[PDB]
């Protein structure tokens, strides 16, 4: 009465065991070049990634959709994790860390697109969504901080008789944005995109105020 | 029978590709 169920389970168990051995042995080959990216530095991943795609390309010539989706989703999750950690520890450090992380995403997408071109040659939804939100929430802040630091050389010439409370206006403009409840590094909110386009108008207002000041003291 | 034939052909192709890859890797190692 139970022996039909037992032979069915035997067939299922042998097939599952065989595919598990192959899958585990091939996913284990990946490990010795995926190991650096759990705790190391953000720039190291740039040099590590070519080994990772050589490995993935040799192993996906054998055994498919689940491998691509799951592997790529977690490796890009780990890239986001490492970038977010390496930014979180001002100006030059912040701009450097954002440049490095954006360059990492750029070389990742470029070499994966070359990999797909080759894979087409011989015989990406998660990447899109996650690295697109990361790259937009990094581009906005990198351009905001580059503009702020370019306007930041004014910040110590306090003895000129017309640059006293204007810099306090610029400080308030910075502070009101940098007192808002949302986390700036998170793309989980995506509501700061109206705050940035309100900041961008009073930056040009500061520009034209200083231009009128120059025009007005001559 | 079709599954067995497909498995055998896949194994043969994998072995061939493996030999070619090993040769490529050896050449790259020698160059380095």
């Amino acid at each position: 009465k139970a022996y039909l169920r037992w032979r069915g389970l035997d067939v299922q168990i042998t097939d599952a065991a065989n595919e598990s051995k192959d899958n585990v042995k091939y996913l284990a080959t990946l490990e010795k070049s995926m190991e650096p990216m759990y705790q190391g530095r953000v720039t190291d991943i740039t040099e590590s990634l070519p080994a990772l795609m050589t490995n993935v390309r040799m192993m996906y010539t054998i055994a498919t959709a689940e491998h691509m989706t799951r592997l790529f989703t977690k490796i890009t999750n780990q890239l986001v994790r490492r970038c977010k950690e390496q930014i979180m520890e001002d100006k030059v450090t912040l701009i450097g860390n954002m440049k490095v992380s954006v360059e990492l995403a750029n070389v990742y997408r470029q070499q994966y697109r070359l990999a797909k071109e080759t894979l087409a040659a011989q015989p990406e939804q998660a990447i899109f969504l996650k690295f697109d939100l990361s790259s937009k929430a990094l581009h906005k802040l990198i351009d905001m901080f580059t503009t702020i630091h370019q306007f930041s050389s004014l910040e110590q010439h306090t003895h000129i008789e017309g640059l006293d409370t204007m810099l306090k206006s610029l400080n308030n403009i910075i502070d009101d944005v940098k007192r808002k409840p949302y986390d700036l590094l998170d793309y989980s909110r995506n509501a700061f995109d109206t705050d940035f386009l309100e900041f961008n108008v009073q930056i040009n207002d500061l520009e034209l105020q200083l231009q009128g000041f120059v025009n007005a003291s001559f | 029978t079709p599954e067995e034939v497909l498995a055998y052909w896949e194994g043969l192709k994998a072995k061939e590709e493996q030999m070619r890859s090993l040769v490529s890797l050896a050449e790259q190692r020698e160059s380095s």
């Binding site: - | 090993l22 190692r29 380095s32």
Partner: peptide, 12 residues
């Protein structure tokens, strides 16, 4: 295994 070894050796 041989391919993985050769790979690691070349990388090293």
């Amino acid at each position: 295994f041989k391919r993985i070894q050769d790979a690691t050796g070349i990388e090293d």
